[PDB]
Design a protein around this ligand. Structure first.
Ligand SMILES: CCCC[C@H](CC(O)(O)[C@H](CCCC)NC(=O)[C@@H](NC(=O)[C@@H](NC(C)=O)[C@@H](C)O)[C@@H](C)CC)C(=O)N[C@@H](CCC(N)=O)C(=O)N[C@@H](CCCNC(=N)N)C(N)=O
Lengths: 99, 99
């Protein structure tokens, strides 16, 4: 699909067996999801942007489905104000910004 | 162009006759630039990012070129970690997300 930018580019994702809405964010290096359980090992990470940093749990090799496109990658979990799909998974679904 | 997301989508912008680097940021409602001088009156705005909220100065109707594309619109100035071109200007330059 072609997603204009008149409104926030929010899509449905499926992660960890759950459906969530998330923002496709070309300004995010990483994908950050609000608190939820994920399987496997995790390590702590600090990520920052406007307003400073939050601490998250980094889970690697997590499968996600973004707007019906499957991918795998690292997912950070923590107190993000909105779920964000960042470039580490946007690449995997073949997302480009075009103008 | 068609910009893939394997690296940050950084572009050159021109504002106030000066070239700067900025990030094309579909996760940003607005465009925020580091401290600089812009003409005219400003209005207060609070914006929220991953880490919390910051205060910025809102300047309207500012001439700005983004990767060679001319826009005229609102630029927030304040303590952003990096200059970000948000949706208010990405729509002016005709940018979409595509996958
Ligand atoms: C949490 C809100 C959605 C996330 C986006 C994030 C982002 O703007 O894409 C910024 C790009 C700016 C780059 C620093 N990216 C980030 O903050 C991401 N940061 C990064 O990718 C890198 N960090 C740095 C400092 O570059 C990396 C080294 O970690 C983090 C998400 C972590 C991966 C964001 O902050 N959007 C703001 C931008 C400010 C603006 N345009 O006004 C927004 O639209 N805010 C809306 C409301 C959103 C709610 N926020 C909140 N705290 N409730 C608003 N204020 O009007």
């Amino acid at each position: 699909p072609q997603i204009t930018l008149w409104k926030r580019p929010l899509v449905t994702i499926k992660i960890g067996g759950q459906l969530k809405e998330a923002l496709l964010d070309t300004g995010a290096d990483d994908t950050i999801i609000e608190e939820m359980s994920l399987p496997g090992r995790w390590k702590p990470k600090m990520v920052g942007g406007i307003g400073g940093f939050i601490k998250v749990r980094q889970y690697d090799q997590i499968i996600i489905e973004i707007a019906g496109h499957k991918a795998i990658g690292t997912v950070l979990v923590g107190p993000t104000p909105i779920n964000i799909i960042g470039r580490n998974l946007l690449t995997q679904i073949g997302a480009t910004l075009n103008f």
